[PDB]
């Protein structure tokens, strides 16, 4: 039997050699591989394949997956392939060919009576995003981020307090404890950062022992060489990560003095470009070092016409020393080159919580438009650029904070945090958001309707976000010390617990597709950024995709 | 009024349509959400008037044309569906390819 | 520019390659329509369909996965079958096999 | 002392011989009995009866009810009587005469210091509805159904997944467990259905042992004779119910083959008319058998002008074989005759979750209008038709699923799930919805107002829907096996647990006021339905009551 | 170094001698004291004081506060002073000078790595309000009251039931238990009142043993001399408070008979003016007795043009005996004189739940306008009047119900329930509401915005109102008996538990700034109120502050 | 439409502005919330039109004058901030002393 490739694409989604446009951008992805056996694809429906004795086997629950995503087009750092995804016990069981071994060939993902089905044909499936620069100013941020496709949120705060408005710090044992307890109520995985600004190591050890997975050094609390050194010493001891927002005022020293204080130790530099904070005007030079894991916050991504104008007031003499067109323009290119490894939000503190993914793709679009294909690109597609950029908000943030053993990508053994997208709305509005094997939120039509599609369709929380089901499908990350001291039992935390590890051993070379260490310089007077003497710059966009065609406001 | 959850939910659609209605009046080419809201609201009012499902399935295809919406929008909306209380109870109205 | 548009490369896909196939003339002797799915064990379909059941043993319809063939009352037509694979163990349907073959 | 019957009706509600119109329909009910002692009615208020030493006694909590609904007009399958209702420990204590035995005669429901009062004079009180065809596509369905007057929801699903969109199945132990946990968060009683489509009995026993109270056989998973037989065998073993959505395609056999496979065993046939699924075009003939408990889904109830037109697309060659004007028209009459015993929704899968009660009364209205009085009717009232129809969404669904020992009617010992209605809004918008003795939801005016009545008045959840109070006032139904294996303790379920029983012994003869087994046939070519050779049909409504006069949209 | 007082006020808020207008009223407060050391004020921000080694010390968590409110202008019954507030373990640690003892002088509130900061410069901080006349008609009242600045709610009810609509009673053990469990879900401290109308003491003891902290005697349940006596006898035994709504009908006796039945025992008279209930037309004379703690409900506060007109229908022969212009006008003056000691709402039963604070200040404004300065006033400010009025909804309600050891004022050791106000919105719309050391609700802008200030800004619940964090930051008050019988463990209450005590020993002389016992009389025919023969009256306002300038509707 | 929480939140602001708009039309002097809502909605529409942040920062100061609002209102609003989807994405518009 034969079938035309067009009819096939309409029935099972695209296959090898087919290209798909990402939303309304100029980025095109080409299916690199297809793990199916033509003619043996599984489809659910009346008279279709997944039925008793046919595509559904006779195996017991233990011998089959709980959930199968059929004919999914996976877009991950390791590849863009077509395959079925199997989920078992809340985790990714396998990527391959689903079906019934009794009558079908090459079945690697067994479907049985205990298997639920999610039809992914014609859809793109990605790992849930991971935002590592969250200011816990309000609990509403969790739903906003979840809706955008972000499933893990790392940050600090206690609510709308002055300290939190400015820094990602959950100060001390009491607040840390209270926030760990409040975390059980949120539908995303959570890890907290304590206040790392102190020159007494015991004051830091207490916070780590209380539960934080990292310490934030912020200039508002004093980003002095003494504080930075103290925080890194405790980090090396307790295997937790340090996030830095340096001395913008150059009060205690210049960028080189801060770098000297860090002493080659692992550290995550927040908003490395500088607009969001850091030694004026050269904190961006940090991306040249092997021990620095650099990230960008999202208001500066990508460089557009209104960027500079809006930034002055979001900030409001050192304003014009902090807001620089030169470093803002360069940042985009540095992302395209892989010099900057992560993207984050900086939620409600010079950052948009629901725009991490959306902005990352806009930068990729603008860079393709301005710079053409990357040197690593093969074929007439943007597959490599896509892998490079998706890594910025998935696997790289996970590696930087020691949680890549649990989340960060679509790999066997990892928690099943997945986002299903229709190609036309990729990166803008997801079709389904799965948390730990359960749908946590999705667009839903009229509740009283005869079908789930009638208007009004808007995002509403599903069963995966309800009480005990939620606790079972989310993770609260703890430091190894907190886990050992029995903090979870003491605070009576109800969610699944995960421990962070490998924070001190990760380096720039470990950032997937983003390990460039450029010989970068910044002119002290003009602020021009140069890599190997070449000027790094770009043009501001007047119009961007993933914008006015999708939003009501 | 004793508004049920569904009645309150429809108020959201109505208000979304007010936004679209005013922008269309300004001479703007409508985007994805604006288009869906405007056409949907039209149908609900048709049901309130007492028009039949059959009549609305057709009428709904003449609310917006391809020249009144942004590029790609017509393709993003293969159909529009909405339910409303007709004289004979709640009925589903499906409009296929509403924008041509 | 169409958001999320496909660029399907032209051509065709060959389905169920390298598998044994056979053709059989089937006739619906019932007074009601019968529709058969791609992976249903053809030898165990509605008894109203008259055909050589012995030849259809271990076979299913050689059509795109998920599709079906319809037989109106009195309709006679020739269909192409393809043999099951995997363990070739048949369970379910009308309960005529319930084991290998 | 004397008082005119009109002034009396205005003060204590109607009494024996008085008639009341149900909403804006043509259905009239006549009070059959009044359990009060004229002059001794209890009324609450300043200077009224329920006061210390007067209508309120000196007894301790153990010797008096927690709640009394005064002067209620009860409408249940057993009668339409005026009486006071006593609730104690979350259950119906007694139906009779409330007061203080110290100074009042014939007191059967003692009122004391521990008694709360709900004024029901001029109101109609009914048992909470029971919907047995729920697709758990989204958690929002619970509030929608509760608001309509439905207090128990039986069905299956895991959220907005392909499998759930199409079938009422919660596949396997993992999903069953997760959904049982999520159930604690919903304000209605819940029982789950697993996937019954498999030819290996152990795969089914696992699901029952995990917690499901029934198994759904759906054609999308393969409604073959082998699967049906396997499911019924396990059902007979474990005392759980089976719900069927037959082979519409006639792929494995015709309706008679399915009936043969069932082999006289008890089974609940979903949407027996066929539009929602089933052997085309004669699945409706199932209502002739003694072992079949037939129900209808609600989009086809009642037959109206727009019915056919809307149905084609809600479905979208076998479309015109499934959507038949002939069987749709007949279904209404079969309900009026008692051949069809239940009504359900088929929530968001060709059914409206908040319209089960509303549509049942519209069918009754249309049948009275077209067919006149029933042969069982006595007096100039529609009392019997009313009892016949109310049984369709209360007691009958409860009997069919083995939960009638807990809910289903206003009888002593049963859980106090009651709905209070103003006659003008009967079946459309309730005044109060009580779950387990506590008000769970009700229309509420301006929160900051001087009284609870100022606008805007809309349904808002009350104390009975909050945290622990909710857990105490709702029931999660389990299979006898799950209860025995200690599933509630393992999953740490917080709500009250109830076990199902008597699912295999219930038959058509047991359906209250709906036990007709007609000699029914369907013409294979024309689709005409005939009972004893007589053509069964009806005319489509152009306008219906309980519609445009009550809804804003 | 020197700095002008204006620039100083702009930078750290007002200091000694500076005056501030309360919202848009004519009330002005003058800073009486400032506990800072000029030049050593703590300010948070980039390059500011609270930084490592500077304003932030090296002490461990145990040796520093968890939260510090910097440069707060405190307005409490004991004073109007400028100072820093320290909060530790959810309680008020100290009021003084915050900082780092290592380099700063006079530090009484140590700031360390474990300290969160809330910038209060230019803000007014007050204790959370306490409403003791709550009808638990719906759970939504809690959020409404919290938003207005009320953090403790005492009352009774079971939801929108007839008994609750009319009285503040939670009838019997079952309902009391259910409501105690539901309380864990609400973001305010809660104490319940049972039904005190019974002549059998055991029926009352049961309710107290079940958990109520008081008993409400309401005329609708029979406010007879026998019932009143019985309730007071049990109150004296179990150390719980009694709230009274007397016999308006004069059925069992006149006001003097009720007073005689009370027999000099402590009792809280609700809506003492009479419009909301009580012996017509002289229940107001109760404020002359030493054992009476009198409060007003809010619809009559203050006397305005539309007051009488609206009241007739909110009530609807004894209507015109209950609604009296004479007693309504006098009530305002009696509050100004300190004859009436508390203000409350009477939520949704002739009272506005979100208008207790707002109306108390409107009365103060109208009294200043009509009567000028109080005899106790010193200086050209309204400091004493302000202290007198704030006491009416904070400390006095707490003393009356035996919970002043936990809440009621900004004093060391008390729970940290604080409200932060911008002077322009004082008493109308708060900036931050802190419950037990955590922000529970606050106005919040666009969730996806770059900052928390963009529109739309509306009140949204924060972390202090979420699950377990909420349980840790709220208190459920129990009677000493209930606490002893282990009710909290039995019902498995998750919130912090507090016990009431000192209810029987509090008298009129104990009411802060409101201990006046006037020689008051009421003319039986004309209803004129006279104190020492002088006519007490006032003029109705045509326009009021804290009204149309702040609300959208 | 697939409305996200933020899109639904903005519908609240739009509706609040409809209230203010009708009252201003009646000739009433606007209060605090009405003023904030009216000016904010204006800016959102400007962004939908494609105006720049710079242009709106100025235009927003000429929507209401001191004579169209209640006494004290101008002082209660030192600035107004709102974000909207411009052709180049979401941008923050801050209008200082909008009412003069
Ligand atoms: Ni920063
Ligand atoms: Ni930040
Ligand atoms: Ni079905
Ligand atoms: Ni169904
Ligand atoms: Ni009262
Ligand atoms: Ni009251």
Swiss-Prot record, chains A, D, E:
It is found in: Cytoplasm. Ni(2+) 2 binds at residues 216, 245, 271. Heterotrimer of UreA (gamma), UreB (beta) and UreC (alpha) subunits. Three heterotrimers associate to form the active enzyme. The apoenzyme interacts with an accessory complex composed of UreD, UreF and UreG, which is required for the assembly of the nickel containing metallocenter of UreC. The UreE protein may also play a direct role as a metallochaperone in nickel transfer to the urease apoprotein. Its cofactor is Ni cation. Substrate binds at residue 218. Its main location: cytoplasm. Changing residue 216 to A/C/E: Reduces activity 8000-fold and abrogates binding to nickel ions. Carboxylation allows a single lysine to coordinate two nickel ions. Changing residue 322 to Q: Reduces activity 10000-fold, but has no effect on KM. HAMAP family: Urease_alpha (MF_01953). It comes from the Bacteria. One of its GO terms (biological process) is urea catabolic process. This is Urease subunit alpha. The modification N6-carboxylysine is found at residue 216. Residues 128-553 form the Urease domain. It catalyses: urea + 2 H2O + H(+) = hydrogencarbonate + 2 NH4(+). The apoenzyme can be activated in vitro in the presence of nickel ions and carbon dioxide, which promotes carboxylation of Lys-216. Changing residue 133 to A: Abrogates activity and reduces binding to nickel ions. Optimum pH is 7.75. The keyword Hydrolase applies.
UniProtKB/Swiss-Prot annotation, chains B, F:
Its EC number is 3.5.1.5. Pathway: Nitrogen metabolism; urea degradation; CO(2) and NH(3) from urea (urease route): step 1/1. It is found in: Cytoplasm. Keywords: Cytoplasm, Hydrolase. GO terms for molecular function: nickel cation binding; urease activity. Its main location: cytoplasm. The keyword Hydrolase applies. The apoenzyme can be activated in vitro in the presence of nickel ions and carbon dioxide, which promotes carbamylation of 'Lys-217' of the UreC (alpha) subunit. Gene3D superfamilies: Urease, gamma-like subunit. GO terms for cellular component: cytoplasm. GO terms for biological process: urea catabolic process. Signal peptide: none annotated. InterPro entries: Urease_gamma, Urease_gamma/gamma-beta_su, Urease_gamma_sf, Urease_subunit. It catalyses: urea + 2 H2O + H(+) = hydrogencarbonate + 2 NH4(+). CDD domains: Urease_gamma (cd00390). The keyword Membrane does not apply. Optimum pH is 7.75. Pfam families: Urease_gamma (PF00547). PANTHER family: UREASE. Belongs to the urease gamma subunit family. Heterotrimer of UreA (gamma), UreB (beta) and UreC (alpha) subunits. Three heterotrimers associate to form the active enzyme. The apoenzyme interacts with an accessory complex composed of UreD, UreF and UreG, which is required for the assembly of the nickel containing metallocenter of UreC. The UreE protein may also play a direct role as a metallochaperone in nickel transfer to the urease apoprotein. This is Urease subunit gamma. It comes from Klebsiella aerogenes (Enterobacter aerogenes). The gene is ureA.
Swiss-Prot record, chain C:
Optimum pH is 7.75. GO terms for cellular component: urease complex. Changing residue 41 to A: Reduces activity by 30% and reduces thermal stability above 50 degrees Celsius. It is found in: Cytoplasm. Its EC number is 3.5.1.5. Coiled coil: none annotated. It holds the Pfam family Urease_beta. InterPro entries: Urease_beta-like, Urease_betasu_sf, Urease_subunit. One of its GO terms (molecular function) is urease activity. Belongs to the urease beta subunit family. NCBIfam families: PRK13203.1, urease_beta. This is Urease subunit beta. The gene is ureB.
């Amino acid at each position: 039997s034969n079938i035309s490739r067009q009819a096939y694409a309409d029935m099972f989604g695209p296959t090898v050699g087919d290209k798909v446009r990402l939303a309304d951008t100029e980025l095109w992805i080409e299916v690199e591989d297809d793990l199916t056996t033509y003619g043996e694809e599984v489809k659910f429906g009346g008279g279709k394949v997944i039925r008793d004795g046919m595509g559904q086997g006779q195996m017991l629950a233990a011998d089959c997956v709980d959930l199968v995503l059929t004919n999914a087009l996976i877009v991950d750092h390791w590849g863009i392939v077509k395959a079925d995804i199997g989920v078992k016990d809340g985790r990714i069981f396998a990527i391959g060919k689903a079906g019934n071994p009794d009558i079908q060939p090459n079945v690697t993902i067994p479907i049985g009576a205990a298997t639920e089905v999610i039809a992914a044909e014609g859809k793109i499936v990605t790992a849930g995003g991971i935002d590592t620069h969250i200011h816990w100013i309000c609990p509403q941020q969790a739903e906003e981020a979840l809706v955008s496709g972000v499933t893990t949120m790392v940050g600090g705060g206690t609510g709308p307090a002055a300290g939190t408005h400015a820094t990602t710090c959950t100060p001390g044992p009491w607040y840390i404890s209270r926030m760990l307890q409040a975390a059980d109520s949120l539908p995303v995985n959570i890890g907290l950062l304590g206040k790392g600004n102190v020159s007494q190591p015991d004051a830091l050890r207490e916070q780590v022992a209380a539960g934080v997975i990292g310490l934030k050094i912020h200039e508002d609390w004093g980003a002095t060489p003494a504080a930075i050194d103290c925080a890194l010493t405790v980090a090396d001891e307790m295997d937790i990560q340090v996030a830095l927002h340096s001395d913008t005022l150059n009060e205690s020293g210049f960028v080189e003095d801060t770098l000297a204080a860090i002493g080659g130790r692992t550290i995550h530099t927040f908003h490395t470009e500088g607009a969001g904070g850091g030694h004026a005007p050269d904190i961006i030079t940090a991306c040249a070092h092997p021990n620095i894991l650099p990230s960008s916050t999202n208001p500066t991504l990508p460089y557009t016409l209104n960027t500079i104008d809006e930034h002055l007031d979001m900030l409001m003499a050192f304003a014009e020393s902090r807001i620089r067109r030169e470093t803002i323009a360069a940042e985009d290119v540095l992302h395209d080159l892989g010099a900057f490894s992560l993207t984050s939000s900086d939620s409600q503190a010079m950052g948009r919580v629901g725009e991490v993914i959306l902005r990352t793709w806009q930068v990729a679009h603008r860079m393709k438009v301005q710079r053409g294909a990357l040197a690593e690109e093969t074929g007439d597609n943007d597959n490599f650029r896509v892998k490079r950029y998706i890594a910025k908000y998935t696997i790289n943030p996970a590696l930087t904070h020691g949680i890549a053993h649990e989340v960060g990508s679509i790999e066997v053994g990892k928690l099943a945090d997945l986002v299903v997208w229709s190609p036309a709305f990729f990166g803008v509005k997801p079709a389904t958001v799965i948390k730990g094997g359960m749908i946590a939120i999705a667009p839903m039509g009229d509740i009283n309707a005869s079908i789930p599609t009638p208007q009004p369709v808007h995002y509403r929380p599903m069963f995966g976000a309800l009480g005990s089901a939620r606790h079972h499908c989310r993770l609260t990350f703890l430091s190894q010390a907190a886990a050992a001291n029995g903090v979870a039992e003491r605070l009576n935390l109800r969610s699944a617990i995960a421990v962070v590890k490998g924070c001190r051993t990760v380096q720039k070379a470990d950032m997937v597709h983003n390990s460039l260490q450029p010989n970068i310089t910044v002119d002290a007077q003009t602020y021009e950024v140069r890599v190997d003497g070449e000027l790094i710059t770009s043009e501001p966009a007047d119009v961007l995709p993933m914008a006015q065609r999708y939003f009501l406001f | 009024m004793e508004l049920t959850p569904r009645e309150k939910d429809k108020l959201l659609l109505f208000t979304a349509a007010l936004v679209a209605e005013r922008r269309l009046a300004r001479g703007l080419k409508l985007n994805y959400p604006e288009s869906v809201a405007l056409i949907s609201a039209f149908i609900m009012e048709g049901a309130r008037d007492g028009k039949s499902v059959a009549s609305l399935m057709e009428e709904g295809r003449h609310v917006l044309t391809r020249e009144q919406v942004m590029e790609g929008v017509p393709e993003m909306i293969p159909d529009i569906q909405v339910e409303a209380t007709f004289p004979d109870g709640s009925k589903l109205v499906t409009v296929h390819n509403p924008i041509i | 520019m169409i958001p999320g548009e496909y660029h399907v490369k032209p051509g065709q896909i060959a389905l169920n390659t390298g598998r044994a196939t056979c053709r059989v003339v089937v006739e619906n002797h019932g007074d009601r329509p019968i529709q058969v799915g791609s992976h249903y064990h053809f030898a165990e379909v509605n008894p109203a369909l008259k055909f050589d059941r012995q030849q259809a043993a271990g076979y299913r319809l050689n059509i795109p996965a998920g599709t079906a063939v319809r037989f109106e009352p009195g309709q006679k037509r020739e269909v192409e079958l393809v043999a099951f694979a995997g363990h070739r163990a048949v369970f379910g349907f009308r309960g005529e096999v319930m084991g290998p073959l």
